[PDB]
Design a protein around this nucleic acid. Structure first.
Lengths: 173, 157, 190, 205, 159
RNA sequence: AACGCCUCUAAGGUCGUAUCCGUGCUGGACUGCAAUGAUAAAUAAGGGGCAAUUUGCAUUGUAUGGCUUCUAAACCAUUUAAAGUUUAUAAUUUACUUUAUAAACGACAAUGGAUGUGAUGCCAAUGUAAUUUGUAACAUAGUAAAUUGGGAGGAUCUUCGAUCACCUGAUGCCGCGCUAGUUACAUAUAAAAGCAUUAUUUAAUACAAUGACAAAGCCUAGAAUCAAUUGUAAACGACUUUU
RNA sequence: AUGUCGGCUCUUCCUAUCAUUGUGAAGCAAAAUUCACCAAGCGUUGGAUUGUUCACCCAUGCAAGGGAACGUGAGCUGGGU
RNA sequence: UGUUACGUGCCCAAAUUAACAACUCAUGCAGAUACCAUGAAAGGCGUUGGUUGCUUAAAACAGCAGGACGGUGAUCAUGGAAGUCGAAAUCCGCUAAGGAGUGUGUAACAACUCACCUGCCGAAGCAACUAGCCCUUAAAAUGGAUGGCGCUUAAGUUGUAU
RNA sequence: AGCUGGUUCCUUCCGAAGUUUCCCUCAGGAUAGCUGGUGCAUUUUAAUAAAUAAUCUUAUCUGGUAAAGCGAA
RNA sequence: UUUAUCAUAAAAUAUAACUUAUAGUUUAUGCAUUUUAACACAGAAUAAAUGUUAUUAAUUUGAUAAAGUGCUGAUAGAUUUAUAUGAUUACAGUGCGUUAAUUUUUCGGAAUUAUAUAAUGGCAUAAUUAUCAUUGAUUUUUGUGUUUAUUAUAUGCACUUGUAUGAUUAACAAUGCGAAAGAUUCAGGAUACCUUCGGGACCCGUCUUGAAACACGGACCAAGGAG
């Protein structure tokens, strides 16, 4: 569930008589180098036949988030499978990570729709520049002059005393 | 940051006293330039020193396999796996009350109305600083929520 | 959605001072003294040192958001109750057999006799500081009046609920004391 | 009193959730911490007044038909409702569990010597901390009176009487506490046996 | 709004969870509800985003240019003399005290307790005539009133 | 309010069943518990009782190497998640209650053990101990030992409700203790053989309870049940009556 | 070798509520009944015939709802089988 | 003696996790691990996230105010219908806009309604779909069963980390 | 008596089948299969492979199910 | 990505003349002051605020792989009949008698450098052979030259409580005690059985697919009693 992004390429077997089968690639969200290949064939199958082990892997390579301190809005376009009911989504996530966005995605999808990690298909990734954010929740973050109340707290339990005689003390002023 | 951890980790060993290396600060705090390298923990409860106030409140069990040859011992001051790891090695004693004597001269002469069962502490049971203990006898389990007693002999430096 | 800020403003008149310790707001006007507890919701009162007080919501979904406007309107009802007063009016519809409403000062209960010539006397508990006045030049109108809006119209509702017309057509036996008007006692002009 | 640590922990049942408190207490009894729980009418259980009322009414439906006096004791009191919650969490069918129940004392409306005693908070049990905002909750003493607890009226008078003795002791305690701090502060600087130990401690007391 | 604590730009936060732990930090930018971009260059924590569940927010609010990279944060922090206010901060001195409540190699512990009994005598020994209660007394004397004037003045006396 | 609005509903709030649950009615926790009475045995005897006692001595727990403990004063009164703990000035109160101004621990890190919060301990002990320290000075802060009478108050399963306080007045005089600081003088324990000292792992002592041999120091002199008997009672015990 | 059916006797519950309580519907005007709800707390019977549950009739009462433990033969009866 | 499958509030060995993000608040089997000890068809402006199409700054969307007629009872069904039990049908005119008419219904006329365009509202909102949990549906019989206590920012449900 | 009931010490090691066929057979046998025991002959599958047995793969055959078809019989 | 720095867009976050309001207060329904998560990218300007191109920093940051590089704690085990009829052998330390030089301690000593032989890597050169494509690399094999490092051989004999010798537990030490018969003291034990604690244990025989069964025999015990 560990969200690492991987470039996988796969040609379809190698004959000397028979030249240079075409080279397809994908970006794959996987914790796993193996899951990177696993999803890669399944999505490759959807356009272009190519069953592993009439299938040639090629190279498995992990790709490098360009800006993990970078403060960006991503739109992901998503397909999920419901019980009687496969449908399409666009949702927008504000994350450090394209990796972090997807990880927050599988959790969010899982929750609301009952969203199966196996029942979810990714679709597409783009970084949203600039007011193309339909995103009512998202566009709240873009707002000049972003000060926001800290609402509530979170009470470590109890203490370094199991026995807290100094009463928490919901106050905080 | 793997390098930075390595540099940061030289510093507490330096302070200990010695082998004489690295300084690369660490706080013990005024410090001229450090709130840097962190406020303890902590995770407590007490005794400590003849005897950690200790509880025999269990045996090491399977769901319904009693397996008493090792016991679970909760050391009061040990919340954490780190703290209970201090106690890994220590000798334990359970001193308890008898109506009837038994034992005459070899060392002292105990009027054996006071009986002692002697044990050692072993490895760290708990996510929450309970520890395993082996005893030479083994503790009868009539000792449950009875206070058992852990002397800080054997302490390594 | 968990919208982080939604604010409402309640405009306070010059004659009235409203002093909030906690969520209990004690308002002192010209007609007197209204205390109501907003203590169940947990909402915020800010005086932007005006007479106007702003009541706000932070980090509360949709249900919480909707309840901020109940209080703004509720405090507006206290402000309107201490200058203007609240007044509710009730008709007493009988096709022949007169709904006879007796009592008053105030210390009323509300004794309903000869509805629908049923010997049964129903007596409907008078709620505290609501007063009832029988209306002059308006034939059998009972007016239920009090500073606190909830108490008054709830007192007016209880006398509606019993006369309930049992076992016989409510559409043809129009028979009942039904609330006709939701109104204010005093203000504006004249 | 004499314990592994304190043989009497007087616990304030105020703003504790009933099962959260019961479970942590059950552990403490097994550990040998011998606890007394006071103000179980001030004990809260989550889920609306009404929702709790119907849950609790479901057990009295349970009744041993042949001789119902063999049959389930539907314990009215909030102290006894707390007691049932703890007892179920303990293996009370064993003789070990009998010892553990004897370690436990449960009182509604804090009497005898427990009132000049400090009611300790268990912070896991705390309703205000654990329970989410805007969630309606029931108070156990309200629930108790519905299922037939006679003594709701009785305890409320006994609690008021207790609070009044507890008010006068507080008032004198606060007065005394002023006069103790001045009597340290005024002798402190005036030689050095208070300057030596306080400022060599220098922590933050 | 009385003012509860704002997740604001520059409201500061002393982040408990981290390799940062106990370092004082300032909120650069408000990310998402869960996170804030935080930079504390004078406490020497490098720039990172971190979760608002890892950090709990301070009283201290300094007019901050919100969106500042490390250099301008470091320039704005020593202009605020923020570190110096944070040493005055008596609850941070109390936070530096638990780094000292640690050990105080047991030698120093019985300093306290030997000498606490110096003060513990002197309390009971200062005690017992205001107004409040009553308060009193006209003894029964020659030692007892000369023990009360043995606070006060302290000549001639007993007995 | 959502849905500028509007609406029994989302939040909050009112009435409302032959229901339900109490009141009530019925068994009465076999011994779950309270209150109160007499508290024996009679003298050639002694017996019990206050025994919480007090002594030789014994038993047992505590602390177990003084003590390497411990604590029935004690962080409110709450709606409660902007909910909130307080101080002070100006008012206000029976109520950390109520009002305005200024701040403040702005559910941070803090805090949660101890402020041991009537500032405990493990102190007293100026050699702190399986001995106790004893004895001299200086100056500062400054300590107190005893008895009796009277007037009012308190008690929710609680270790003595024919008990324990508080206050006020009176009596005198054992001067019994003195402590902390600094400083003088002297010494037993301590040298526990052991170089591997933990191993069979203590007890002088301290505190709390219990004991009782012969003896000692105070107080007081029941009834139950069976027989016989009633009928209000009943198969028999038992119930209710009796001399 | 797990004592058929009914009827006599006796039990407790369940509703999918006919009556009664409190209620919402009605092409309910009144009267009356029908529908639906919370509800089994409380009723739901006396006979002719049948061995009969079932059935079919008669009479009253506002109303003569329906089911579960093939209930119930060291309880009966032994009538049908 | 060491480590796993299945689990981890406690019962009952074990993190009320020194992690985390949602969803759900359940009055009569809220829910609680494959087999499995049941739950649907069909509904829901409860709540939650999606999809698509709208009105519109020449002021919109809710909500009031205000017109809702005339060529012409145009007309056929006449049992009665001027707009309206029903229908062949159905276009002009006046126009800012008003259907030979969406209904309320007098048996008719008529009086009400909505479209259409306006005064205010001058910036939000409205419709049709998808599917999670919850709720409705979903009622049965000795008292009773996620195995129990109990659990509501879960100890549930989905996903994720030690 | 093909039926029912019972059958008398222990340990060690290996360890089934309810199927085939025929039978007035079908509550049972025989028979084959599964089971053990007894061993025997040789170990390049044996005592100080260029000989296989049987499972993948490969190479070389077969098939009318799933799917598809009905503008194919 | 980020630090440090340059140019451009550009200041869309903040700072910044100034414009406005509520309001405590002040002045006299309105003003002036100031405070206000109440105003306006509001002017020039500033921090390049963000984006883009360039340069970087002990080059970051993430991941993964690798070195007995160095090292600590704890846990359980430790057959040892090693001549019943089978091994005790191997290595290492230390001393012995080749020298020198430099350095450290500065005493005793210790290290490194100065040889021949063999192997190996690294440089250059050449041939083959396979390969990615030929700019250039990689592979297997072989030879040659140069220099350097590393490693092994040329290091025997004596002694040794040195390391292992393939289940290598003992140095070292304390304590009980075998104290004649007599008999103390220590350790150890689900004998019978009692106690105290946890956990587990349903009735055997049998037919049967399955038996604790609301299946059948068996009250209990002795002795006869069946491949």
């Amino acid at each position: 569930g560990l969200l690492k992004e991987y470039e996988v390429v796969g040609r379809k077997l190698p004959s000397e008589k028979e030249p240079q089968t075409p080279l397809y690639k994908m970006r794959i969200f996987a914790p796993d180098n193996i899951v990177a290949k696993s999803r890669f064939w399944y999505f490759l199958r959807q356009l272009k036949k190519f069953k592993k082990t009439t299938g040639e892997i090629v190279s498995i390579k992990q790709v490098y988030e360009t800006s993990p301190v970078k403060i960006k809005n991503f739109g992901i376009w998503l397909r999920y499978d419901s019980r009687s009911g496969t449908h399409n989504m666009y949702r927008e996530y504000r994350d450090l990570t394209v990796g972090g966005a997807v990880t927050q995605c599988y959790r969010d999808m899982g929750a609301r729709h009952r969203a199966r990690a196996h029942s979810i298909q990714i679709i597409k990734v783009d970084s949203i520049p600039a007011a193309k954010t339909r995103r009512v929740h998202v566009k709240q973050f873009h707002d000049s002059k972003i000060k926001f109340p800290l609402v509530q707290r979170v009470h470590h339990k109890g203490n370094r005393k199991l026995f807290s005689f100094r009463k928490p003390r919901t106050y905080f002023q | 940051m793997a390098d930075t951890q390595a540099k940061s980790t030289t510093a507490p060993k330096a302070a200990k006293a010695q082998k004489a290396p690295k300084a690369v600060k660490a706080p013990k705090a005024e410090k001229p330039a450090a709130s840097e390298a962190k406020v303890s923990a902590k995770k407590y409860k007490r005794h400590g020193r003849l005897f950690a106030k200790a509880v025999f409140t269990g045996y090491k069990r399977g769901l319904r396999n009693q397996h008493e040859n090792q016991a679970i011992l909760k050391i009061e001051g040990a919340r954490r796996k780190e703290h209970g790891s201090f106690y890994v090695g220590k000798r334990c004693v359970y001193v308890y009350k008898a109506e009837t004597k038994k034992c005459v001269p070899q060392h002292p002469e105990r009027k054996t109305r006071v009986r002692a069962v002697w044990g050692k502490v072993t490895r760290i049971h708990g996510n929450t600083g309970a520890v395993r203990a082996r005893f030479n006898r083994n503790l009868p389990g009539h000792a449950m929520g009875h206070r058992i007693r852990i002397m800080l002999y054997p302490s390594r430096i | 959605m968990r919208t982080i800020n939604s604010n409402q403003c309640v405009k306070i008149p010059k004659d009235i001072k409203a002093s909030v310790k906690a969520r209990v707001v004690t308002i002192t006007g010209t007609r007197g003294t209204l205390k109501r507890s907003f203590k169940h919701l947990a909402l915020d009162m800010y005086m932007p040192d005006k007479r106007t007080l702003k009541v706000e919501k932070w980090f509360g979904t949709k249900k919480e958001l909707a309840a901020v406007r109940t209080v703004c309107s509720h405090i507006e009802n206290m402000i309107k109750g201490v200058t203007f007063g609240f007044q509710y009016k009730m008709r007493a519809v009988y096709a022949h057999f007169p709904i006879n409403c007796v009592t008053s000062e105030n210390n009323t209960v509300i004794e309903i006799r000869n509805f629908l010539g049923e010997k049964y006397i129903r007596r409907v508990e008078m709620a505290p500081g609501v007063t009832v006045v029988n209306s002059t030049a308006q034939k059998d109108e009972l007016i239920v009046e009090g500073n606190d809006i909830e108490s008054v119209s709830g007192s007016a509702a209880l006398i509606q609920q019993s006369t309930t017309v049992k076992n016989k057509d409510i559409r043809k036996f129009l028979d009942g004391l039904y609330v006709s008007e939701k109104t204010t006692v005093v203000k504006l002009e004249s | 009193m004499t314990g592994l640590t304190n043989r009497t922990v007087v616990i304030d049942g105020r703003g504790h959730l009933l099962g959260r408190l019961a479970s942590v207490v059950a552990k403490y009894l097994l550990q040998g911490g011998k606890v007394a729980v006071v103000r179980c009418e001030e004990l809260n259980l989550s889920g609306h007044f009404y929702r709790n009322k119907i849950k609790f009414l479901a057990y009295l439906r349970k009744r041993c038909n042949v001789n119902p006096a063999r049959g389930p004791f539907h314990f009215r009191a909030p102290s006894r409702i707390f007691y049932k919650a703890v007892r179920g969490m303990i293996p009370h069918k064993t003789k070990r569990g009998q010892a553990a129940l004897a370690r436990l004392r449960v009182f509604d409306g804090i009497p005898s010597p427990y009132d000049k005693r400090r009611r300790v908070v268990v912070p896991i049990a705390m309703r205000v901390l654990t329970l989410r905002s805007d969630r309606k909750y029931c108070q156990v003493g309200r629930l108790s009176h519905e299922v037939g607890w006679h003594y709701q009226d009785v305890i409320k008078s006994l609690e008021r009487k207790r609070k009044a003795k507890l008010r006068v002791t507080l008032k004198h305690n606060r007065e005394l506490k002023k006069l103790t701090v001045k009597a340290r502060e005024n002798i402190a600087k005036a030689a050095e046996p208070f300057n030596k130990i306080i400022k060599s401690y220098g922590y933050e007391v | 709004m009385p003012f509860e604590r704002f997740v604001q730009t520059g409201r500061i936060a002393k982040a408990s969870a981290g390799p940062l732990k106990g370092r004082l930090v300032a909120i650069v930018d408000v990310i998402d509800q869960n996170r804030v971009l935080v930079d504390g260059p004078l406490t020497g924590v490098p720039r990172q985003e971190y979760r608002l569940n890892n950090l709990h927010l301070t009283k201290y609010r300094i007019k901050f240019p919100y969106t500042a990279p490390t250099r301008i944060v470091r320039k704005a922090w020593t202009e605020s003399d923020l570190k110096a206010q944070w040493k005055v901060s008596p609850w941070s001195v109390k936070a530096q005290n638990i780094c000292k409540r640690s050990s105080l190699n047991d030698f120093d512990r019985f300093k306290l307790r030997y000498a606490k009994r110096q003060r513990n005598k002197l309390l009971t020994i200062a005690f017992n005539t205001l107004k409040k209660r009553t308060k009193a007394d006209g003894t029964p004397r020659v030692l007892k009133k000369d023990r009360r004037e043995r606070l006060r003045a302290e000549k001639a006396k007993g007995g």
